[PDB]
């Protein structure tokens, strides 16, 4: 099928003008059949962002918000839904639990329905739960049980602080070496993305001695989006549990962690799903794992439910991944979730990844054209990311992150050079992809 | 000074009344001068809850509810400071965190400075974070370092499932013997509460043996209130570590965990501290082991703030109990709690302590008076209980717990025969307790 820069020129093409014009992005939102989605969410208008200079605005605009990776914007319907739990818990406080049309007890155990499609996994492989990190934690405890012949950690590269950090602690925690143990695939030299057959060498050439291999979803760095499947399998061969950090992945692109034999998983709410600041996180646990797998730390809503209540003690323990489930589900994040995934179920994921990769691609397009003193260093493979793009500038005497925010322009930048910007499918539209560009433009000219 | 017993027939003295006369009751919160208060609180009404047999009831009347000790109602103010931080979302997305008045990175380590004096530790001694069990679990993982010598663990008798729950876990983690290694301290046959006597007398014979010590600071199931400092003194002569699980005593009792020097503690927000369902929860660690005891699992909240973000990976710890924060704080339950800590700090810790004792005491007396057919399973000694009482019925032939429900009184029930009634001083009156009383007459007497 048709590429996504195949696709602009070809506009251009039945519009007679020329690729870069305005009226290519004007007609790609014009047959955009997810354009009134965007109207569901809160879009920051240009005067209220602080690190802008007013002078070099226009005023009463829409801000170009890029950030839809590392704290998404808020649905409009999320203060409604916070409304209907408030003034329940205003109406009847603790009979909220049990009693009437959605009893609290349920919450977590009935969103999850709304999560099936986005992870691909079944009702009773995913639970919404805790942070991200400390279902990283509680999944780690279990899955990575370390012997004398197989003691390694497989993760990548400059990963994710929180990631290397949790995984030091981990190895630190059964007295191992942190040198030997932590196998960090490196990228080769002068290349920032790492290549699929370096990472399955060292899987097949160590992989009899690695207890677990656990790699992000999407390197946050680059933006690569890692072949799930195949690392998997190629893990699972060498006897390895497989595992990934989903947060960039989840809501951005499609994912079939069931199908794909992935042993766990574990994610947050607050970046593509659009859920509150810290908003509640999620975990995944193969059901091949039901019971073969306990957690390692246990709490009471780790019990069946039918004799929770009685407080005897006597633990039955539910099978699969509720069961790593410690403590009471923070009903008013749930609440917040909730509205969030009842736009990704009308908006299909599929609706969303499609849309991800022509708009992605079509800010692709218009950098590669006009310049090289910019490096797209996110691989340029439509499979190979997602929503974000990574760029490193060569202009020496200006600052192209500060220059860009002065105008409203909300993205990120990583150290050392990196700036990251996630067009997302939801509430970013192709205008906001022409209008970034041109600013860009307007900047590297000076 | 005055006994709250005492208390009573003086008013009655002073009124000319008997002491079981509606007039006390009526009297005593007019110079109630937390009376106010209770406006601050959302109070259900009583055809508004489900279980009520609206025959009879007086409909248009206010509910008593004591559960203030399981589910705590809500401050009208929740849902105001949820808008400040709704609003502030949907305009600066992502500049939230470092731009404004105030900013989310600094939300959970700002607040912990309305939480100083509810415990009585430092600003740095203290982090509102996660959930109860997994914070219990997260000092654990430090704490409970065990040795040959060394490797028991000293928990009360029908302890709170979570906590006996999280306890085996953590002995099953370093493949220790249940039997051997949870001592349980039972009481004395025919006997409800533990003795302190008794206690102490465990920790001098076996401390040398034990690693942990952790008891709830209030026993759920019959409202005792442990002396903690005693308890400390006692297991650290020994050379144990003490901590406390301090879910029903946080909000409920004064606490000076610094000068009492108890090395860890947990509670959670949505009982006394009236936060929402599953609302956030805190950590404590007392200073003399901000060098010494590091967190076992890492994230990378526990990263000092001015370099957090530059991801180098160079971890750079933040000593005492931030440094077992792994994740982004979940902001809009900070929000929630900040609404009832600044209705703490009003009406002072103190002033709620000193009514919660008269108050429980004026429900102890009335019950008492009339009955014995009716048990009050909690420690009558005034400083041996918190508000919660718990009652034991010898009436066959009626259900009390569901009689007591069908008319409006929201209060627990637990297995086998004990419910809990639990008058906060925050909504609570003592025509509150009247009311309930001459229910529960009204029932004992057929």
Known sequence: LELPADTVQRIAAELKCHPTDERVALHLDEEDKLRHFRECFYIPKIQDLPPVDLSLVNKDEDAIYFNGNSLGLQPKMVKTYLEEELDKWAKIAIYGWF????PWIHYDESI???MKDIVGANEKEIVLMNTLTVNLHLLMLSFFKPTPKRYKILLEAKAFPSDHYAIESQLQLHGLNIEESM?????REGEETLRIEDILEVIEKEGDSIAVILFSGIHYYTGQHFNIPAITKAGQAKGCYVGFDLAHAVGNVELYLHDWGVDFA???????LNSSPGGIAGAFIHEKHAHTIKPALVGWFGHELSTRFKMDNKLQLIPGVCGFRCSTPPILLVCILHASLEIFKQATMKALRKKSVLLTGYLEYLIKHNYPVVNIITPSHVEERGCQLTLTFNVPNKDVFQELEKRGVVCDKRNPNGIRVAPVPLYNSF???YKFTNLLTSILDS
């Open 266 to 272: 574990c994610w947050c709410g607050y970046k593509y």
């Open 431 to 433: 205008h906001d992809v």
């Open 183 to 187: 196998r960090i695939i490196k990228p």
């Open 99 to 102: 009693e009437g049309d959605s």
């Open 112 to 114: 999850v329905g709304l």
